[PDB]
Point group: C2
């Protein structure tokens, strides 16, 4: 949907997974560069049918469920307003 | 974007957070009912600018970073194909 910034292109893995090619920096990425609000450089949010939504750190070649910048404690439960309706 | 199933409506919290009202079951929800693929009943995926993406269990009033169905081990690191470009 969102336009690629100048200097990018897209391709596909042998499993059908889209990736983004940055010809400005000669690097490749799982996510659109305009869809990384709140993420530090080197980190991406990824979606998995087996593991759900998690985060990868390309600079350390590791992954974790928690956003890199989230408090290192479990996140807060909040319910929507009760049915009124 | 996606049409609401029959019997639903939408409203807004005093913080500007959208929620979904199910008049079929007299319940309320943070997420669109057609956007919960892979989630068990009672669980939702939520987005937070402070905590990132996590999951809430309305039946236990708790939250966790890991998808309820994800393996209880850290998720796998996978890099996109190296720049060719
Ligand atoms: K450029
Ligand atoms: K281009
Ligand atoms: K997560
Ligand atoms: K109905
Ligand atoms: K309606």
């Amino acid at each position: 949907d969102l336009p690629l910034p100048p200097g990018w292109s897209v391709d596909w893995t042998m499993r059908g997974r889209k990736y983004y090619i940055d010809h400005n920096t000669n690097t490749t990425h799982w996510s659109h560069p305009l869809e990384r609000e709140g993420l530090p450089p080197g980190w991406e949010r990824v979606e998995s049918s087996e593991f759900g939504t998690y985060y990868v750190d390309h600079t350390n070649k590791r992954a974790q469920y928690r956003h890199p910048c989230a408090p290192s404690v479990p996140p807060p439960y909040v319910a929507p307003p009760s049915y009124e309706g």
